Structure formats: C-alpha cells, structure tokens
Chain A
C-alpha cells in the first residue's frame, strides 16, 4: 500500500494555523520524488535531506502537519524563524529534519467579502515549544487589572481572522502548507523510501 499523501495535499478542508492538523503516516511505500513533481509548489524546501536522497532512507514515522497562512508568512515555517506564526502558532525545532511544502490557494480559500474562517493567534504570554499546539481562547491580559472574560482596555481577544479576499495582494493571499517531519525511535522502521 502506497503512502496516503493525496489525502493530506488534496483534503477539502484545511485547519487554521493556531489549530494546525496532524496526520501520522504509518507503514507504507514512501515515494518522495513523485510528490516533488506532483503539483506546482511555490515552496519545496527540505532540512537535512534531499527530495531524491529520501528515496533511500527509512523512518519510524512521518508526521504531516497542515494549515493555512498568508503568502508573506510562509518564510516563518522554517527552523530559526520569528514572527506571530513561528512564535505563537506553529514552531519548528532548531534541528528540524523534514520538508516544508506550500502552494497558493487563493482560488479555493478566498471568498468575496472575506473568508473569516481561518484564525491565527496574535498574543501569547510566551513563545510555543517546537510542535506545540495552543487552542485556548483566554482573553489576553496585557494589563495588571484582570480581564473578566471580556475584551476591553488591556484585555485582548487573542485570535484574529485573516479574512482572505480574491483581490488581495500576493503576500496576503491564502497559502496551504504541509510540513513533513521524519522521526526515529527505538522501534522498527515503518516508512521507507
């Protein structure tokens, strides 16, 4: 059985970045080179591996993380980066081993008048740990006075919608992102090039 990859890349609904979706890829024929020439990708960059030299490797598990961000935030889905997405939404480790794949989805994810379904976290008391997920909706206390569950002075709703529109500039258009992390554990390898 070939690795269910079209299920991730061709999923109808994609997660909001703050609530990024994980799919675990199990024991299957991992064919990596065909993927790299499966569609026109605006981003295909790998970290400690090649698109062709992966077809001679074995791993315990592959994790496929998927979400939507705007074009000018794709740069943030890389080791060592900063910004709202890397700090408070989706963090890659320093020693990351995987690929980051992205494509423009303005044909799909943009609605006229705005698609307000996609959220990102604007405020957090501290940066996320690598592969951390925060789905909390606590009002963000920037002040000394407590927020009683209601936004106000010094009390900020922590999430914001992108509001993707078709006429938006390239940097502001929605981009679908798939992140493939490659794992090794003290257990038999399951996914192989």
Chain B
C-alpha cells in the first residue's frame, strides 16, 4: 500500500496570496496523482490530474507540479471561493489512497475569546443529568485548550466540544464545550470552572453552585 502524506495539515492565508500545498508519496508514482477540492457538506471536485493537467472548467489560479514522490498544488491569487479542503490521491495502485487533506483558512489578527459559563438548568436537573456548558465566542486562532475544573480538580473523559466554521463577517471561530455529570455528582461540588489556554494566556470563568 502506498501512503500519501499531505502538509501542512492546515494553513491560513489572505485573499491575493500564493498558496502551496505539498503531497509526499511513500514511493515514486510517476504522474498517477490527482488533486481534489471539498467544501463543507459537499462532494469532492477534481482540480488537477496527471499531476499537472488542469481539469476543464477549473480556474487557472490552480496548478500542479511534482516529480517522483513530491507533488505540490499551487493557488496563485487566492480568492474567497478557494478557502476549502484539498486532497491528493494516488491512482498508481490499489487501494487508490488519499492524503489526509489540507484546510486553507482565512488569515486575520489574533482575537481573545469572550468566555461564558452556563450552569445546568433546573429543568434538566429534574431529569437526573447535569450539563455544564462553556462558550468561547469569536476567537482567533483556532487552536485553544479547553479544560474543566470542579472544586479545582481537573476533569478528563467527561467533556465533549465542537467548533464552528470561520464566521462570514469577522472570520473568527467559536467553541462550545459540555461537561456531563449525573445530577447526584453535580450536587456534590460547589465551584465549576472552564479554563481556556492559547499561547501564554489562560482564562478561567467560573460559578459557585451554592451562589449565583
């Protein structure tokens, strides 16, 4: 089996930029190399085949090159419609393995999240479950570490999170994390806190169950 490793995993760029994405194969694959574009909720689309040939009707700001193991996709004058995920695929031999993909994101200035913490509603508690929710609103860049602390004890394995796509207006991300406990476990503790870490800064928002 031929392995395809794409790099970088993601990159940030501005409209007008020249962007390069590389794909390395585990062996020489001649020109059995294709590039695909995919946008959220949509089927992949062919851009380049035979490593270098522009697919009919695809904009000429896309181009491919490569030799032996190393292949590159270049987008010369990046347009809004070009922010997407890009996949390489080898068709040299079965199985026709794809690279893991490269997400092209919109560059902007750093922005601190607004951090909000939500206690479980009375209504939910009356059903025997407690969901504690942490919102990180309108932040950049995407990378953030979100941790839960209950009476200063760090939690693991009892939280899940998700992140929105880049906002259309401001190009920021928002993150929601949910800590899940039984009513009984929730009622055992006082101080509930969500900590977010980006670079050299950590911010912790909390509430006291007893208070409000």
Does a CB–CB distance below 8 Å link A and B in the complex? yes
Whole-angstrom distance from the CB of B31 to the nearest CB of chain A? 10
Which of the 9-residue segments A14-22, A31-39, A101-109, A143-151 touches chain B?
A143-151
B94 engages A153 (CB within 8 Å)? no
B94 engages A145 (CB within 8 Å)? no
Would you call the interface of chain B mostly helix, strand, loop, or mixed? Answer: loop
B92 at the interface (CB under 8 A from A): yes
B30 engages A152 (CB within 8 Å)? no
Q: Which residues of A contact B91 (CB under 8 A)?
A: 152
Whose C-beta in chain A lies nearest to the C-beta of B31? Answer: A153
Complex alpha-carbon distance, A149 and B96, angstroms: 13
Q: Which residues of B contact A152 (CB under 8 A)?
A: 32, 91-94, 96
Complex alpha-carbon distance, A95 and B94, angstroms: 45
A149 engages B94 (CB within 8 Å)? yes
Whose C-beta in chain B lies nearest to the C-beta of A150? Answer: B94
Whole-angstrom distance from the CB of A74 to the nearest CB of chain B? 35
Interface set, chain A 123-172, CB cutoff 8 A to B: 145, 148-150, 152-153, 155
Would you call the interface of chain A mostly helix, strand, loop, or mixed? Answer: loop
B92 engages A148 (CB within 8 Å)? no
B29 at the interface (CB under 8 A from A): yes
What interface size band does chain B fall in? under 10
Q: Which residues of A contact B94 (CB under 8 A)?
A: 148-150, 152
- Digit string of B87-122 for contact with A (CB within 8 Å is 1, else 0)? 000011110100000000000000000000000000
Complex alpha-carbon distance, A149 and B94, angstroms: 9
| Neighbour of B29 across the interface among A145, A149, A150, A153, CB < 8 A | A153
Complex alpha-carbon distance, A150 and B94, angstroms: 6
Complex alpha-carbon distance, A85 and B147, angstroms: 71
- Digit string of A45-68 for contact with B (CB within 8 Å is 1, else 0)? 000000000000000000000000
Whole-angstrom distance from the CB of A114 to the nearest CB of chain B? 18
Whose C-beta in chain A lies nearest to the C-beta of B30? Answer: A153
Whose C-beta in chain A lies nearest to the C-beta of B91? Answer: A152
Most buried by A among B29, B30, B32, B94: B94
Q: Which residues of B contact A145 (CB under 8 A)?
A: 93
Interface set, chain B 5-45, CB cutoff 8 A to A: 29-30, 32
- Digit string of A63-82 for contact with B (CB within 8 Å is 1, else 0)? 00000000000000000000
Interface set, chain B 44-97, CB cutoff 8 A to A: 91-94, 96
Whole-angstrom distance from the CB of B2 to the nearest CB of chain A? 10
Q: Which residues of A contact B93 (CB under 8 A)?
A: 145, 148, 150, 152-153, 155
Most buried by A among B29, B91, B93: B93
Complex alpha-carbon distance, A150 and B95, angstroms: 9
Complex alpha-carbon distance, A155 and B92, angstroms: 9
Q: Which residues of B contact A155 (CB under 8 A)?
A: 93
Whose C-beta in chain A lies nearest to the C-beta of B28? Answer: A153
Whole-angstrom distance from the CB of B26 to the nearest CB of chain A? 14
Complex alpha-carbon distance, A185 and B32, angstroms: 55
Q: Which residues of B contact A149 (CB under 8 A)?
A: 94
Complex alpha-carbon distance, A153 and B29, angstroms: 8
- CB pairs A–B below 8 angstroms (13 shown): A145-B93, A148-B94, A150-B93, A150-B94, A150-B96, A152-B92, A152-B93, A152-B96, A153-B29, A153-B30, A153-B92, A153-B93, A155-B93
Residues of A within 8 A of B (CB): 145, 148-150, 152-153, 155
List 4 tightest A-B contacts by C-beta distance, closest first: A150-B94, A152-B93, A153-B92, A148-B94
In addition to A150-B93, A152-B32, A152-B94, 15 A-B residue pairs with Cβ atoms within 8 Å of each other are A145-B93, A148-B94, A149-B94, A150-B94, A150-B96, A152-B91, A152-B92, A152-B93, A152-B96, A153-B29, A153-B30, A153-B32, A153-B92, A153-B93, A155-B93
